[PDB]
Design an enzyme around this catalytic site. Structure first.
Site, short mmCIF file in Angstrom:
data_model
loop_
_atom_site.label_atom_id
_atom_site.label_comp_id
_atom_site.label_asym_id
_atom_site.label_seq_id
_atom_site.Cartn_x
_atom_site.Cartn_y
_atom_site.Cartn_z
CB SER B 110 2.68 -77.01 42.54
OG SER B 110 4.03 -76.84 42.17
CG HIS B 156 7.01 -75.15 45.06
ND1 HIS B 156 7.51 -76.25 45.75
CD2 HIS B 156 6.23 -75.65 44.07
CE1 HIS B 156 7.05 -77.36 45.22
NE2 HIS B 156 6.26 -77.02 44.18
#
Lengths: 5, 173
Positions: B110, B156
């Site tokens: 991610s 992230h």
């Protein structure tokens, strides 16, 4: 442990 | 059908995930995680391999979903070499920052995904000509997830940064 998400 | 780089990375992640089910998470983490000990700093694969590890079915599905959608879109429009470089820069730097935040026990694509979300959106705003764009409906949910962040929070935000940066640099040229 951490999930990148 | 999405290109060779989009597929190669989905097969990497599935092969690794399946291994995590057979060997157990920890065993795979021991070899593919970011160096936990400076002595290991020359085990170069680890700065990348953290990205291939997922921890639940939803974790892999949700990540590969976004990766297929966005990775394939970059590969289709900007070529295989572009997606390699977005992947490698973003995996390494989101890894670097995720380690600093919270140490080396983390994994997942991610970081690369948030970099792709950042790249596709900025590049679509400043260079609509590239043929890639992200719907505001998706940049919204993307933001909703962030603020909801066991998440790799440094990944992230570092990934996102990297993807904006690269998009800007490429949107200038």
């Amino acid at each position: 442990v951490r999930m990148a998400a | 059908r999405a290109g060779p780089v989009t597929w190669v990375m989905m097969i990497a992640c599935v092969v690794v995930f399946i291994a995590m089910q057979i060997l157990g998470d920890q065993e795979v983490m021991l070899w593919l995680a970011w160096p936990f000990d400076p002595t290991l700093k020359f085990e170069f694969w680890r700065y990348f391999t953290h990205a291939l590890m997922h921890f639940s079915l939803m974790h892999i599905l949700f990540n590969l979903l976004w990766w297929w959608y966005l990775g394939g879109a970059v590969e289709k429009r900007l070529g295989s070499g572009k997606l390699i470089v977005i992947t490698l820069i973003s995996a390494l730097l989101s890894g670097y920052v995720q380690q600093k935040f919270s140490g080396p026990w983390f994994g997942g694509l991610s970081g690369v995904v948030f970099a792709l979300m950042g790249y596709v959106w900025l590049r679509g705003e400043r260079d609509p000509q590239s043929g890639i764009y992200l719907q505001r409906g998706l940049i919204i949910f993307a933001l909703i997830w962030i603020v909801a962040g066991s998440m790799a929070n440094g990944a992230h935000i570092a990934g996102l940064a990297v993807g904006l940066a690269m998009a800007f640099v490429d949107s200038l040229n």
